Amino acid sequence: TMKFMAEARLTLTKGTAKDIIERFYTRHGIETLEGFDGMFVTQTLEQEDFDEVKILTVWKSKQAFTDWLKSDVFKAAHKHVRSKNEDESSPIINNKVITYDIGYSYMK
Amino acid sequence: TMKFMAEARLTLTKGTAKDIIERFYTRHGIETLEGFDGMFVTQTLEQEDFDEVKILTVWKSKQAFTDWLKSDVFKAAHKHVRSKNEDESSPIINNKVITYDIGYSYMK
Ligand code: HEM
Numbered sequence: 045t046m047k048f049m050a051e052a053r054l055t056l057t058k059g060t061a062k063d064i065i066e067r068f069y070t071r072h073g074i075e076t077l078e079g080f081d082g083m084f085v086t087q088t089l090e091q092e093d094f095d096e097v098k099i100l101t102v103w104k105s106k107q108a109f110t111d112w113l114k115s116d117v118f119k120a121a122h123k124h125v126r127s128k129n130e131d132e133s134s135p136i137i138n139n140k141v142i143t144y145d146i147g148y149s150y151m152k
Numbered sequence: 153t154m155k156f157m158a159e160a161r162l163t164l165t166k167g168t169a170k171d172i173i174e175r176f177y178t179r180h181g182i183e184t185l186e187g188f189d190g191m192f193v194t195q196t197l198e199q200e201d202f203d204e205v206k207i208l209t210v211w212k213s214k215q216a217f218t219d220w221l222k223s224d225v226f227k228a229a230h231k232h233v234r235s236k237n238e239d240e241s242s243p244i245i246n247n248k249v250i251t252y253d254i255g256y257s258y259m260k
């Protein structure tokens with residue numbers, strides 16, 4: 045079932061992680077995708093200059109994730125999302141996307 | 153309840169990830185710890201010179217994880233694990249441990 049993971053790694057103004065994280069309590073339709081299995085939003089411990097928040101998403105296939113990226117619900121979730129280069133008031137400093145095959149999983 | 157994540161990031165000789173990942177199909181007792189919630193073992197996509205394998209573990213608390221680190225089941229799991237510096241035949245070149253608070257999670 046859980047075969048592919050996509051991560052968005054966000055670099056944020058120090059101290060703004062809690063505010064960004066609370067936004068994830070509200071669904072925007074990712075849950076409607078048959079291929080979507082789950083998500084974790086993490087804050088990296090022991091960071092000096094910036095906060096780091098990772099959004100980890102777990103999928104039945106790479107295709108489920110690639111379709112999501114192109115979907116209306118992805119657009120809806122990210123409609124009002126701006127990075128500092130687009131809106132100076134945004135705490136989002138940098139973003140990188142990393143993808144993975146999940147070779148083994150076990151949820152207790 | 154998934155409040156803490158610990159990651160072991162392994163840098164491996166290119167082409168050896170499959171062999172290493174298969175080892176994780178065998179449990180060594182981590183599942184017996186109340187504070188353990190689950191694990192994923194991933195291979196990073198698009199890596200050029202080395203394979204990258206991550207072991208992600210999800211816990212009810214940091215204490216659950218640090219207790220496991222010094223536990224007998226940790227030793228049982230890692231008893232016959234060697235890196236290249238200890239045994240040149242090992243494809244395990246380097247390791248880094250990263251820890252995280254989990255601020256939000258949802259499994260569909
Ligand atoms: C690349 C630049 C990105 C930025 C700056 C960003 C930031 C954000 C923010 C702030 C939210 C919360 C929206 C709100 O409720 O106000 C959100 C939603 C979300 N993001 Fe992104 N994100 C990016 C791309 C990605 C990627 C590649 C993934 C794939 C893992 C991802 C995963 C998610 C998920 C799962 C949600 C909630 C979706 C839903 O509930 O329907 N994000 N993103």
Ligand code: HEM
Nearest residue numbers: 158159160175178179180181182191207209229233247249
């Ligand atoms: C940093 C040095 C480490 C290396 C080189 C390493 C490598 C390995 C290998 C090769 C195995 C498979 C053993 C087998 O069945 O033959 C294993 C077991 C495992 N490793 Fe590690 N590991 C390290 C530390 C960690 C850390 C910090 C974590 C925490 C996320 C972790 C998570 C796990 C888990 C959950 C298992 C299976 C435990 C069980 O089933 O009881 N490892 N490790």
